[PDB]
Design a protein around this nucleic acid. Structure first.
Ligand SMILES: [Zn+2]
Lengths: 129, 226, 122, 98, 324
RNA sequence: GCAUUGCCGCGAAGCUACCAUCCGCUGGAUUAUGGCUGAACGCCUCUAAGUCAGAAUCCAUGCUAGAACGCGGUGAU
């Protein structure tokens, strides 16, 4: 079972990271001791630029996609269907492709506007003289 | 009908086992003597399921359910959870509970109609009990004890409480239950009656050290003889 | 995580505040080492503050919170917020009716009665 | 209204006889055939009910491409995936991708 | 024991397992090169233990397995003074790795190693076939001469290693004929070793004290991984298409594009070291021997730092796009 | 010009650690000693027949080293 890092949002694995449990039984997994010591100092990941609290709070990547509707922890279990398994495998591969495509094309929106503002700003370095 | 049973040189029964009308949950640890003991009792009528809950032999305190539903905590792994879903039929509902505490057999005691809960449970689990189990929910302490399952054993036959329960408290609580109550000892003086024994509407299973007066109490209030 | 001479919390509702361990039951014998308690360990512990009836008397107590990161069998390193123990008999039958705070999974697997009085497991 | 619930398969079950040449086999009965107490191994995959018994031998996968399979497996994935593919046909023929 | 250093860095096999002549003719050991260590998730099937049907995480050691090739044989006859080889038999075409092994100054030698031996197949084989029939006739026990495909390995030494292997199949004549067909051909461990095999490891440990021959026994093989598999790092649970190679590769070693053996526990010696994998000297039946393990997940992250991904596709999927 | 690694945040690599992990409870014959059944002596007894345990004793097996003045096979000269 893959969990996220509490401080990175990075996938936590067996053997990887430290868990802290408060008195209210809330488990917090950290992928590394940088995350763990950052939590020890009571720091905000919204302050640290590299972690995904800042990046999903900032708008570098898209954060809501219609591809995200498929990944969710389900508390009611489903009986075993072998025939749904390969369809879910194809779904995971295809949806990860579509997510990377939408993320790259979302970054493709960012780089075009600097051309426009560089045009508008190098007009200011010409038209004054 | 009351059968003394032992698990790994321990008289505790509801710790390692979970008994409803329609199924039984057993641990995988130690030996198949305790499982064959229930096979002698229950047999082919209801499915008896070996399980762990987040890698535990302790499952009756971890789980709280009726004939219609079964509630499992957050830490239940989905391999175990899929094995429980493939194990138990469509008539039994299974759902993980996202809440602070994990132990459910201490915190929720129920039958097919009425559940007593931890009076300081969150409201979401108080929703989910009456949703899945289809039972009536009451915030209540048995003699001021906030763990309601280990200190009070329930079925649709009747109920059994620990001996520190006042008779005023027994009537106060049996008005909510509409099934009778007896202050009872189990396993030679152990007040923990919910983990010391399990019961459903045709069977009560307890430890070896549950004495014959205690067995007469259980056989009377849960009507083990027809 | 706790050697001999360690103050730990009291998570049952008996009335003690803190439990001071003076001996560890079932520890090895090596020169200059300390008998170290951990999760799922019954040790002799004395009550420092609380009711004086529980004070000035040692009691056996099982540790439910450790706060030092151990290696569980499934891959995880994890530790509680603090150190905590609950006092009981040598038979493992609890004194407290309800044990507050999170109780360790190995400790509740070890003792059936502690799990019978456990409210919060992990 | 409330009733004690005992199914008819419970009453219809014969009582187990501890001294019987012809009786139901317990777990100790299958256990004592191949070895004894500790060395016997429990089978879980054989017992539980499924739509196909060959699916008893089949294997639930856990991790695909660094993602959990359990978070993605769902009743009726197909209608969601087809609506998703229609959305991607839309974002294609708008010319959004270049 | 007095701690004097090892004689050769390739440690000697002083004892081989017992000859069964009712089994087909097959090897008894192997020489590989240890790449490194990682962590494996699997389920424990141990009734009597509380950890039965429970996920365990286990340290393993992986040894790179290039396919080994047979170039000769050696028959030993019994004397009242001990074992003695009456002769050794070579094949004709031997690599520059092996001809390098005989030489100290290969870079400036005229490379004249087995020239006139190649004239012994210029004939019909009369002396050679006389020697083969002699080892059929005499020489009760048979050892074969094998060397590794060290050019298929990230080792900087182009000089491969030669070793003897006692051949515990049946029929000394069929043994030497088996080796006769297997001259200059290859043998993989898949025909020799298998899954769940309890093996012993013979290796020279890490010098710094150290550099001593050590035989650590009873190690269960966990994966006989094939070189052509791109799902080397995969399981029926771990459906990623990934190799056994770590993220960034094995530290100070390189990679494994070859076959490999992932075996339980630890092992004497370091990385880049020649290690002999021998099958067990007896049929262990401890239930730690009989265990048919079933893996779940393979760590393939970086040990060059605190790793956080398994595949780089996972890395790009989480981190998204970058400025670069 | 300095702080005996000036301090600190976060980290490598190596060494090391039941503080972390893995592997190794090798088999026979024996001495003293402790016994069994059991007569010789109708009680009785470890002994006379036989036999059980038991020393670092002896052998086997495995491991480590290899006669630097032990040996063999094989290559080219
Ligand atoms: Zn992190």
């Amino acid at each position: 079972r893959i969990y996220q890092c509490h401080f990175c949002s990075s996938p936590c694995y067996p053997g990887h990271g430290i868990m802290f449990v408060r008195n209210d039984a809330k488990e917090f997994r950290f992928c590394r001791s940088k995350c763990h010591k950052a939590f020890k100092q009571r720091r905000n990941p919204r302050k640290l630029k590299w972690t995904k609290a800042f990046r999903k709070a900032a708008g570098k990547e898209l954060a809501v996609d219609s591809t995200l509707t498929f990944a969710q922890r389900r508390n009611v279990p489903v009986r075993y269907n072998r025939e749904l398994v390969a369809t879910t495998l194809k779904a995971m591969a295809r949806i990860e492709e579509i997510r990377q495509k939408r993320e790259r094309a979302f970054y493709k929106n960012r780089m075009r506007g600097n051309k426009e503002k560089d045009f508008l700003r190098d007009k200011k370095l010409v038209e004054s003289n | 009908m009351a059968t003394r049973t032992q698990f790994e040189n321990s008289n505790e029964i509801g710790v390692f086992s979970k008994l409803t009308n329609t199924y039984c949950l057993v641990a995988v640890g130690g030996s198949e003597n305790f499982y064959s003991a229930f096979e002698a009792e229950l047999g082919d009528a209801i499915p008896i399921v070996h399980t762990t809950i987040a890698g535990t032999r302790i499952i009756g305190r971890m789980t709280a359910g009726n004939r219609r539903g079964l509630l499992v905590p957050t830490q239940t792994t989905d391999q175990e959870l899929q094995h429980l879903r493939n194990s138990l039929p469509d008539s039994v509902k299974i759902q993980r509970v996202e809440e602070r505490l994990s132990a459910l057999g201490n915190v929720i005691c129920c039958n097919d109609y009425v559940a007593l809960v931890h009076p300081d449970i969150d409201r979401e689990t108080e929703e989910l009990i009456s949703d899945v189990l289809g039972v009536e929910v009451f915030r209540q302490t048995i003699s001021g004890n906030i763990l309601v399952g280990s200190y009070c054993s329930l079925s649709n036959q009747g109920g059994l409480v620990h001996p520190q329960t006042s008779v005023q408290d027994q009537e106060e609580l049996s008005s909510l239950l509409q099934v009778p109550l007896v202050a009872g000892t189990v396993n030679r003086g152990s007040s923990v009656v919910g983990a010391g024994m399990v019961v459903n509407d045709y069977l009560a299973v307890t430890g070896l050290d549950t004495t014959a007066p205690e067995l007469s109490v259980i056989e009377s209030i849960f009507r083990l003889q027809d | 995580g706790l050697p001999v001479g360690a103050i730990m919390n009291c998570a049952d509702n008996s009335g003690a505040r803190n439990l001071y361990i003076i001996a560890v039951k079932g520890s090895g014998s090596r020169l200059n080492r300390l008998p170290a308690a951990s999760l799922g360990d019954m040790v002799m512990a004395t009550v420092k503050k609380g009711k004086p009836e529980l004070r000035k008397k040692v009691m056996p107590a099982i540790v439910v919170r450790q706060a030092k990161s151990w290696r569980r069998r499934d891959g995880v390193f994890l530790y509680f917020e603090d150190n905590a123990g609950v006092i009981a008999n040598p038979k493992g039958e609890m004194k407290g009716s309800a044990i507050t705070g999170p109780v360790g999974k190995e400790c509740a697997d070890l003792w059936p009665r502690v799990a019978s009085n456990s409210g919060v497991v992990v | 209204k409330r009733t004690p619930f005992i199914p008819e398969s419970v009453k219809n079950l014969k009582k187990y006889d501890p001294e019987d040449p012809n009786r139901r086999k317990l777990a100790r009965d299958i256990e004592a055939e191949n070895g004894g107490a500790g060395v016997f191994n429990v089978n879980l995959k054989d017992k539980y009910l499924l739509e196909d018994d060959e699916w008893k031998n089949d294997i639930m996968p856990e991790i695909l491409d660094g993602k959990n399979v359990y978070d993605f497996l769902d009743p009726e994935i197909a209608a969601k995936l087809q609506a998703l593919e229609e959305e991607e046909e839309k974002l294609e023929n708008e010319g959004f991708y270049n | 024991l007095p701690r004097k250093r090892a004689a050769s860095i390739r440690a000697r096999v002083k004892a081989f397992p017992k000859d069964d002549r009712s089994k087909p003719v097959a090897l008894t050991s192997f020489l590989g090169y240890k790449a490194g260590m990682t962590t494996i998730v699997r389920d424990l099937d141990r009734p009597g233990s509380k950890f039965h049907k429970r996920e365990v995480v286990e340290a393993v050691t992986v040894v790179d397995t290039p396919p080994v090739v047979v170039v000769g044989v050696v028959g030993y006859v019994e004397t009242p003074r001990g074992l003695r080889s009456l002769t050794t038999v070579w094949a004709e075409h031997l690599s520059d790795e092996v001809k390098r092994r005989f030489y100290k100054n290969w870079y400036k030698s005229k490379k004249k190693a087995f020239t006139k031996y190649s004239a012994k197949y210029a004939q019909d084989g009369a002396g050679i076939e006389r020697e083969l029939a002699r080892i059929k006739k005499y020489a009760s026990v048979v050892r074969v001469l094998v060397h590794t495909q060290i050019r298929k390995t990230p080792l900087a030494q182009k000089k491969a290693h030669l070793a003897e292997i006692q051949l515990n199949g049946g029929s000394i004549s069929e043994k030497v004929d088996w080796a006769r067909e297997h001259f200059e051909k290859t043998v993989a461990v898949d025909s020799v070793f298998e899954q769940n095999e309890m093996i012993d490891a013979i290796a020279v440990t890490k010098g710094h004290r150290g550099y001593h021959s050590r035989t650590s026994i009873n190690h269960k093989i966990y994966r006989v991984g094939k070189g052509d598999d791109e799902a080397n790092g995969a399981t029926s649970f771990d459906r990623t298409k990934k190799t056994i190679t770590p993220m960034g590769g094995f530290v100070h070693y390189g990679e494994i594009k070859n076959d490999f053996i992932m075996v339980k526990g630890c092992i004497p010696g370091n990385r880049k070291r020649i290690v002999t994998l021998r099958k067990s000297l007896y049929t262990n039946t401890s239930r730690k021997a009989l265990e048919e393990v079933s893996l779940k997940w393979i760590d393939t992250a970086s040990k060059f730092g605190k790793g956080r991904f398994q595949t780089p596709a996972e890395k790009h999927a989480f981190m998204g796009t970058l400025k670069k």
